[PDB]
Design a binder for this molecule. Structure first.
Ligand code: CLA
Ligand code: CLA
Ligand code: CLA
Ligand code: CLA
Ligand code: SQD
Ligand code: LHG
Ligand code: BCR
Ligand code: BCR
Lengths: 122, 56
């Protein structure tokens, strides 16, 4: 088990926990029980921006960008209710957490695209 | 003395200073190439190769 001092400055704090390859199981849902997500974590690996179409009005594509705001991008410690619905579907209702990060990515040619990467009120 | 249009004839029997002058000329030309490339990069819009290419 790792401490703050093991992790601090390594970049691991911006990484979501992972599971090993053996974890291909199934988590039973009891429609009589109440559920919650205690921790939801989102770790972006790629930011794509839709190019502003020349004026040909064809399919404008999402193009790669370079992250310039460093390892400050992940959403974490997000919690919320996990409703079991009549039809057996599950609905996560986000209540709180670190559910946003400002992010600046840089386009080819230099254009910087700030965005509020978020799942607020998910 | 030398007329103005003959000032460089002093290099004719001076291979070392002729080499110096050629070096200076080459330096000027290469400096031109660099600065020209820089100005074009400072002005070129790469956003539309179809209807706004470099030759436009
Ligand atoms: C390739 C360029 C080049 C080279 C290698 C030389 C080399 C030589 N010239 Mg020069 N010369 C040049 C161009 C060049 N000349 C030009 C264009 C002129 C007309 C102005 C002259 C006029 C000239 C004279 C009258 C004489 C020489 C002489 C000589 C020799 C001694 C150096 C000297 O006195 O400089 C003098 C030359 C200069 C200082 C060049 C003028 C600088 C101009 C204005 C550009 C400066 C760049 C500037 C920072 C950019 C401005 C940007 C603008 C948009 C505001 C030497 C062998 C002498 C010589 O030995 O004669 C016996 C001599 O008496 N040259
Ligand atoms: C490789 C190219 C080259 C070279 C090395 C020379 C070398 C020489 N020529 Mg020139 N010459 C050339 C091409 C060349 N010539 C061409 C193409 C022409 C026809 C236009 C001439 C016509 C010519 C004449 C009529 C004469 C020479 C003479 C001279 C000598 C003295 C130059 C001098 O002192 O000027 C000093 C020059 C200045 C102080 C200022 C000149 C300013 C010019 C006119 C305007 C600005 C030019 C700009 C800076 C250059 C931009 C670069 C360009 C390529 C785009 C010298 C040995 C003279 C000679 O033999 O002496 C006995 C002479 O009488 N040449
Ligand atoms: C070893 C054989 C040799 C070689 C390889 C060269 C090579 C060349 N000669 Mg040179 N030359 C030689 C023998 C040689 N020469 C001899 C025996 C004579 C009679 C004395 C001359 C007289 C001569 C004259 C009069 C002139 C040349 C010029 C040139 C150059 C024109 C191309 C240029 O400038 O590109 C652009 C340059 C580069 C892309 C950079 C090249 C990197 C250099 C070679 C490294 C410099 C460090 C090196 C240890 C010191 C100089 C090496 C020297 C042997 C050239 C070029 C470097 C002309 C010149 O020098 O123009 C400026 C010129 O005017 N040569
Ligand atoms: C292979 C291509 C080439 C060639 C053959 C030359 C040849 C030469 N260059 Mg040039 N040069 C070149 C490419 C070339 N250059 C490039 C790509 C650049 C970067 C822009 C330069 C920049 C350059 C500079 C900055 C200078 C030269 C000069 C010279 C001359 C030095 C020898 C001399 O004493 O002439 C004596 C001069 C002449 C024989 C007159 C040449 C007249 C030209 C061909 C046309 C002039 C146009 C017009 C009358 C004036 C310009 C318009 C004005 C509004 C600016 C010579 C004619 C030097 C020189 O001219 O010093 C006096 C000089 O100062 N060159
Ligand atoms: C709008 C304007 C603003 C621009 C200003 C920027 C430059 C300012 C400097 C100009 C003043 C020059 C003073 C002269 C010095 C001198 O002593 O001359 C004599 C010197 C040798 O020293 C000398 O040599 C002499 C004999 S001899 O020449 O060696 O034969 C001897 O008299 C003496 O003892 C000895 O010291 O040799 C020369 O003849 C060179 C003089 C020519 C200098 C002008 C060229 C400027 C353009 C350069 C641009 C570079 C382009 C980029 C490419 C890489
Ligand atoms: C990009 C960087 C650029 C910097 C370079 C700077 C450019 C410098 C240009 C120098 C050119 C100066 C001209 C020399 C002018 C000058 O000195 O001429 C007089 C000169 C006489 O020279 P001599 O052999 O007699 O020797 C006397 C010495 O003192 C000269 O150095 O003859 C020549 O130079 C030949 C060219 C004749 C030019 C005659 C044209 C004038 C007639 C009138 C035309 C206009 C009216 C027409 C009406 C229709
Ligand atoms: C030294 C030092 C340094 C730096 C250098 C530099 C800073 C650079 C440069 C270069 C440059 C930045 C300069 C230049 C070039 C320019 C020129 C040379 C041009 C010319 C012009 C012409 C010639 C034109 C004429 C005419 C007119 C003007 C218009 C119309 C017509 C015509 C075109 C004819 C380094 C770090 C490297 C290191 C080593 C040492
Ligand atoms: C050894 C060392 C050093 C030396 C220095 C050096 C070596 C520098 C050189 C100087 C020089 C060598 C200068 C350069 C340059 C340039 C000029 C000053 C001119 C120009 C340009 C222009 C004016 C622009 C124009 C352009 C064109 C050409 C094209 C495009 C457009 C444009 C307009 C951009 C010292 C002393 C510090 C001290 C210590 C030791």
């Amino acid at each position: 088990t790792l401490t703050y001092d093991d992790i601090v400055g390594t970049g691991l704090a911006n990484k979501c926990p992972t599971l090993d390859d053996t974890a291909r199981g199934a988590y039973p849902i009891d429609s009589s029980q109440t559920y919650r997500i205690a921790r939801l974590c989102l770790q972006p690996t790629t930011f794509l921006v839709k190019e502003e179409p020349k004026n040909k009005r064809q399919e404008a594509e999402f193009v790669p960008t370079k992250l310039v705001t460093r390892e400050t991008t992940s959403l974490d410690q997000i919690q919320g209710e996990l409703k079991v619905n009549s039809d057996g579907s599950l609905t996560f209702v986000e209540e709180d957490g670190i559910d946003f990060q400002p992010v600046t990515v840089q386009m080819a040619g230099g254009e910087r695209i700030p965005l509020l990467f978020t799942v607020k009120n998910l | 003395g030398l007329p103005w249009y003959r000032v460089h004839t002093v290099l004719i029997n001076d291979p070392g200073r002729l080499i110096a002058a050629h070096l200076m000329h080459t330096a000027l030309v290469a400096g031109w190439a660099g600065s020209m490339a820089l100005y074009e990069l400072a002005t070129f819009d790469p956003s539309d190769p179809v209807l706004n290419p470099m030759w436009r």
